[PDB]
RNA sequence: GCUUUACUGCAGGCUGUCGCUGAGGACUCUCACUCCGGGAGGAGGACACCGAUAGCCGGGCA
RNA sequence: ACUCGUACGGUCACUGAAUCCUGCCCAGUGCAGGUAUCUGAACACCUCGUACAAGAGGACGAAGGACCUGUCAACGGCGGG
RNA sequence: GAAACAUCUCAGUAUCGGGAGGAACAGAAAACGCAACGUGAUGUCGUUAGUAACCGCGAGUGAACGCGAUACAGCCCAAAC
Ligand SMILES: [Cl-]
Ligand SMILES: [Cl-]
Ligand SMILES: [Cl-]
Ligand SMILES: [Cl-]
Ligand SMILES: [K+]
Ligand SMILES: [Mg+2]
Ligand SMILES: [Mg+2]
Ligand SMILES: [Mg+2]
Ligand SMILES: [Mg+2]
Ligand SMILES: [Mg+2]
Ligand SMILES: [Mg+2]
Ligand SMILES: [Mg+2]
Ligand SMILES: [Mg+2]
Ligand SMILES: [Mg+2]
Ligand SMILES: [Mg+2]
Ligand SMILES: [Mg+2]
Ligand SMILES: [Mg+2]
Ligand SMILES: [Mg+2]
Ligand SMILES: [Mg+2]
Ligand SMILES: [Mg+2]
Ligand SMILES: [Mg+2]
Ligand SMILES: [Mg+2]
Ligand code: NA
Ligand code: NA
Ligand code: NA
Ligand code: NA
Ligand code: NA
Ligand code: NA
Ligand code: NA
Ligand code: NA
Ligand SMILES: [Sr+2]
């Protein structure tokens with residue numbers, strides 16, 4: 160589906176309507192320093208490693224919308240509940 | 252002023268530098284052709300020996316013992332084993348080589364008791380340790396105020412029971428506080444979780 | 446599964462061993478200090494149980510009696526020599542340096558003084574090709590050109606008993622008798638004729654190997670069977 | 683030939699005999715080892731914890 | 739019990755790297771180390787072996 | 801252990817006396833060889849980061865793989881129209 | 882056991898090797914950390930507590946400091962000279 164790159168909508172920060180910019184959430188890079196990373200190093204030894212021996216599952220036929228709504232004035236962002244969309248293209 | 256002993260000590264802080272380096276490269280050649288346990292007239296490290304309780308006296312013996320380097324020499328499982336227990340390569344023994352050395356020495360001298368031991372280097376495939384042993388039956392020692400404690404019946408085979416300094420160290424008894432919950436008063440009394 | 450036959454072999458049990466106690470002599474080149482001065486007389490010719498070929502009994506000047514790996518044409522009474530300045534005649538042993546090129550040699554040493562390693566079976570021989578101050582090149586019975594230390598001792602002539610392979614065993618009994626004199630388990634049951642549990646090629650409702658026969662060099666014992674690291678197979682192409 | 687009765691008739695070999703050390707007829711005269719006390723195998727007397735229930 | 743391109747692992751083989759290990763991207767050398775030689779001595783040589791780790795193969799085995 | 805053995809050997813497999821013979825196929829799988837380029841771990845090295853460290857990236861790149869070739873008395877195949 | 886099962890659990894259990902005593906082991910702080918102007922070798926008993934902590938964060942696993950008691954004990958070398 161088509162979607163406007165910018166449009167007027169409620170800004171939860173300003174508490175008033177403002178022009179927001181829609182952006183697809185880019186994955187942040189991992190540090191490898193979180194607790195789970197330490198547990199993987201610790202709990203991995205001879206033989207099977209339990210959860211650390213599993214390999215990530217498949218995919219759902221269609222993913223939900225993963226967007227960031229950025230307020231034009233205050234410059235802050237907010238998230239919303241996404242919706243199933245095969246393709247999401249921005250207009251402008 | 253400095254003791255002559257302090258110089259032997261300082262030399263051994265870096266067995267790969269200076270005269271000691273040359274010395275080791277020379278001795279090890281002779282050590283590699285010697286046996287498993289070799290009695291020697293004088294300690295290679297006087298400062299260490301004396302520091303550990305050694306004395307130039309009757310009933311005090313020293314022997315150099317060589318043990319193989321590396322992890323456990325383990326035989327792979329011959330019956331069902333869960334993946335955790337199927338290992339062979341990465342398994343290491345719980346006693347350190349110095350402790351193995353002490354025991355091999357004590358067995359060579361059934362009548363003597365292990366007083367202490369120290370490292371004297373290693374090549375690419377083995378380590379050497381010199382063990383100081385004591386004759387608990389010689390009156391020269393039965394009358395020595397500093398060593399006659401080893402003559403007590405309860406000190407019999409002290410090495411096989413881990414009463415040696417290296418033994419106690421390896422048993423995780425160094426710390427008197429945090430971390431020694433499962434080690435003191437004994438590994439066995441603590442369910443073997445040390 | 447169970448360990449395959451190739452694995453039982455390595456255990457060195459009676460069934461797999463050679464009847465050493467029935468073997469005669471470890472035919473090695475006699476040791477000489479230097480100067481070459483050493484000769485002996487062929488006292489007899491005997492059968493060697495370990496090699497199915499003749500062997501010469503030789504008595505030396507110093508009184509030493511030893512069996513020797515006999516080349517062809519050696520008989521009782523003949524005088525054999527061993528040393529740097531030995532005569533270039535069949536039966537004599539001298540370093541590859543003193544041996545003239547183009548001459549057939551047998552029982553060649555791999556490392557000077559080892560007593561002989563190459564070309565020792567019936568009828569075979571190595572060809573001495575090139576000389577040098579550093580290396581003597583020899584062509585072993587397999588056809589391989591072997592660069593060797595010119596100080597490596599060797600005997601002149603082809604090993605006795607040549608042509609043994611020309612006559613067929615004809616019947617199992619004959620094989621049986623030969624096999625009984627070697628360190629080998631015989632007869633041979635085909636892997637493909639066994640149960641899956643006994644060999645990688647075992648199993649199936651009909652006899653045929655499971656997977657292809659060419660096995661990687663890296664294969665572990667118990668699996669390394671069939672055509673070991675074959676660079677090719679068949680006859681065509 | 684049956685592994686039963688017919689194969690029993692060849693059994694005229696002596697193996698286990700009275701042991702010089704323990705008195706039990708378990709000294710294997712071919713192996714020269716007592717299956718009961720370990721005489722011929724060890725200076726120490728043969729004994730195992732599995733010879734009784736774990737709680738005893 | 740058996741099989742395999744089932745899941746997960748473990749031996750084993752190959753390979754890099756660190757240690758043993760030294761002198762003057764390819765090379766020379768000898769002194770550790772290895773082998774041959776009764777020996778004198780010869781070949782080999784900082785490699786190989788061995789200890790450690792990493793990648794690959796791996797129903798040989800669990 | 802083989803081995804008091806050394807390629808006319810001995811190991812590993814297949815076929816199964818003699819006689820007449822044993823075609824075609826290397827695409828897949830196996831094995832083996834080669835390989836410009838691509839891919840390929842760890843140590844060491846470089847950048848960023850941290851008064852250090854965790855960590856992120858880079859450079860180099862072994863066996864292996866891609867790719868190329870050899871091979872069916874290797875596993876096997878030898879049809880529809 | 883986890884209602885399968887691989888980490889986990891059964892369990893450092895069963896069993897195995899070595900060795901001492903009448904008891905063993907431990908033990909006079911490179912301790913503790915109710916953070917203090919505080920405690921003062923070590924075992925053990927009660928408690929702290931199924932608490933903290935661990936864990937396909939599943940099933941399960943699981944201390945310590947302290948406190949109340951028991952009994953109390955403190956010393957010897959190496960080196961300097
Ligand atoms: Cl999206
Ligand atoms: Cl002792
Ligand atoms: Cl044959
Ligand atoms: Cl307190
Ligand atoms: K289990
Ligand atoms: Mg206790
Ligand atoms: Mg011979
Ligand atoms: Mg033939
Ligand atoms: Mg036989
Ligand atoms: Mg057959
Ligand atoms: Mg059958
Ligand atoms: Mg059947
Ligand atoms: Mg099989
Ligand atoms: Mg058939
Ligand atoms: Mg067939
Ligand atoms: Mg040798
Ligand atoms: Mg299986
Ligand atoms: Mg048939
Ligand atoms: Mg269950
Ligand atoms: Mg569950
Ligand atoms: Mg537990
Ligand atoms: Mg605490
Ligand atoms: Na852990
Ligand atoms: Na002793
Ligand atoms: Na522990
Ligand atoms: Na079954
Ligand atoms: Na093909
Ligand atoms: Na269940
Ligand atoms: Na089950
Ligand atoms: Na777990
Ligand atoms: Sr761990």
Ligand SMILES: [Sr+2]
Nearest residue numbers: 204205206208
């Ligand atoms: Sr693992």
Ligand SMILES: [Sr+2]
Nearest residue numbers: 217218219220
């Ligand atoms: Sr799907």
Ligand SMILES: [Sr+2]
Nearest residue numbers: 361407408900
């Ligand atoms: Sr004793």
Ligand SMILES: [Sr+2]
Nearest residue numbers: 471473559560
């Ligand atoms: Sr020989």
Ligand SMILES: [Sr+2]
Nearest residue numbers: 473558559560
């Ligand atoms: Sr010899």
Ligand SMILES: [Sr+2]
Nearest residue numbers: 646647648649
């Ligand atoms: Sr089959």
Ligand SMILES: [Sr+2]
Nearest residue numbers: 679680681682
């Ligand atoms: Sr053909």
Ligand SMILES: [Sr+2]
Nearest residue numbers: 683684685689
């Ligand atoms: Sr029968």
Ligand SMILES: [Sr+2]
Nearest residue numbers: 692693694695
């Ligand atoms: Sr009988």
Ligand SMILES: [Sr+2]
Nearest residue numbers: 715722723724
């Ligand atoms: Sr015995």
Ligand SMILES: [Sr+2]
Nearest residue numbers: 728729730731
């Ligand atoms: Sr027992």
Ligand SMILES: [Sr+2]
Nearest residue numbers: 816817818819
């Ligand atoms: Sr035929």
Ligand SMILES: [Sr+2]
Nearest residue numbers: 826829830871
């Ligand atoms: Sr092919």
Ligand SMILES: [Sr+2]
Nearest residue numbers: 921922953954
């Ligand atoms: Sr007190």
